[PDB]
């Protein structure tokens, strides 16, 4: 199975400079060009460049001449891509792709931020129904920076879920999820929302508990 | 660099029925041109490669046609499911270049909302916070007006409210809407209200509590 592994996660500062990783598997790693392209915060695709892993050689968007630099390192089957002096205008998400016999394979993007503003964990806080369908919620307040993962029940818990876009208030963001059962369901079963911030090394589960 | 239009930011559409995306290229890309579905905060999927050829696994629901400028993808049968954006890109020369995407967007059934209110958690208010958090749940249309009172006095200051993109299950759209206080303003008052108007009912949906209760 063809996989590329990027990490979710980097949080910079502005003028800075990161490395970004692609980490491939299930395929012969130097027979396929490597391409990797930018999303931004609520916009469009843009193509950055590709490079063949068997000699290094790249094509480069000229947008990007002097802002990314692409390698392989071929024994750890990985592609980079370097980004110098780092602007606010950088961030977003940077996916890793290639396409081997007709099939295309992602890597889950890296979401680089690029901001002076501090890495801060969220405190996570489970809300339970005022004393034939219950909703109970999570309320996940103050981080920085994006993204979070929430869940319910560790994912099994996934039908009639709302977990809304978070929004930012004086440079940290909050955001909630709603969750739907049955009246038959809850609290004679568990609910738990699972939290994970990876920027702050944060994972937390929150029971749901009748007040 | 080669321009790629796509001059539909947006189009409405039925379950059912057949939607054409389009895209226009700023010169020749032959049928160098590929088509891309994006599901909110997932990485792109490609859906067809040389103008009219579908990936592997990619339902026969969407097809592709068009070469030298003009493409068009199609769907048919269209489907809560296809509620995406879609990208096309020329891949005929360097720089590869995308279109600006096209969001669908499906009309269907009204649906009245439904409505949680949740007083601040016991854990926040040992920290000093007061969150009161409004869920309204699976309405359509997406017009809706939330209001919030406390102790029977409108509150504006403090609310941050955010939408979920349309449902891809069911073509419904949600809200959460967030009442910030300091613990001694939540302490100060009693009763707390998340009131909906909505063009399914004559009157408001109300949700109420009372801190003491
Ligand atoms: C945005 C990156 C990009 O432009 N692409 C891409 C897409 C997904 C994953 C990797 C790269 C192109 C897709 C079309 N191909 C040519 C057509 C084709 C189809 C099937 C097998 C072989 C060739 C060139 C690259």
């Not at chain 2, 439904?114 to 000093?128: C, K």
């Not at chain 2, 997406?142 to 955010?162: F, T």
Request: glycine residues 6%.
């Amino acid at each position: 199975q063809v996989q590329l592994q990027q990490p979710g996660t980097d949080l910079v500062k502005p003028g800075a400079s990161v490395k970004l990783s692609c980490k491939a598997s299930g395929y012969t790693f130097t027979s396929y060009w490597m391409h990797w392209v930018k999303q931004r915060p609520g916009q469009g695709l843009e193509w950055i460049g590709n490079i063949d892993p068997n000699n290094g050689g790249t094509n480069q968007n000229e947008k990007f001449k002097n802002k990314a630099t692409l390698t392989v390192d071929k024994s750890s089957s990985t592609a980079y891509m370097h980004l110098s002096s780092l602007t606010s205008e950088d961030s977003a998400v940077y996916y890793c792709a290639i396409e081997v016999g007709y099939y295309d394979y992602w890597g889950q993007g890296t979401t680089l931020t690029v901001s002076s503003a501090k890495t801060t964990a969220p405190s996570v806080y489970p809300l339970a129904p005022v004393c034939s369908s219950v909703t109970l919620g999570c309320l996940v307040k103050g981080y920085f920076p994006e993204p979070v993962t929430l869940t319910w029940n560790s994912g099994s818990l996934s039908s009639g879920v709302h977990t809304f876009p978070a929004v930012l208030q004086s440079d940290l963001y909050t955001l909630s999820s709603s969750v739907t059962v049955t009246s038959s369901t809850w609290p004679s079963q568990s609910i738990t929302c699972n939290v994970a911030h990876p920027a702050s090394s944060t994972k937390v589960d929150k029971k749901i508990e009748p007040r | 660099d080669i321009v790629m239009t796509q001059s539909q930011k947006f189009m409405s559409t039925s379950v059912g029925d057949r939607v054409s995306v389009t895209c226009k290229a700023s010169q020749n890309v032959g049928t160098n041109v590929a088509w891309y579905q994006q599901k909110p905060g997932q990485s792109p999927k490609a859906l067809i490669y040389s103008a009219s050829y579908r990936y592997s696994g990619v339902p026969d629901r969407f097809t592709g046609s068009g070469s030298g400028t003009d493409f068009t993808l199609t769907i048919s049968d269209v489907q809560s499911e296809d509620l995406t954006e879609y990208f096309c890109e020329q891949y005929n020369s360097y720089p590869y270049t995308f279109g600006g995407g096209t969001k669908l967007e499906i009309k269907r059934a009204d649906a009245a909302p439904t409505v949680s209110i949740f007083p601040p958690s016991s854990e926040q208010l040992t920290s000093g916070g007061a969150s009161v958090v409004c869920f309204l749940n699976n309405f359509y249309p997406k017009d809706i007006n939330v209001k919030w009172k406390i102790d029977g006095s409108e509150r504006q200051n403090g609310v941050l409210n955010s939408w979920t993109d349309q449902d891809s299950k069911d073509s419904t759209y949600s809200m959460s809407s967030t009442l910030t206080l300091t613990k001694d303003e939540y302490e100060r008052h009693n009763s707390y209200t998340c009131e909906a108007t909505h063009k399914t009912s004559t009157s408001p949906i109300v949700k109420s509590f009372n801190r003491n209760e």
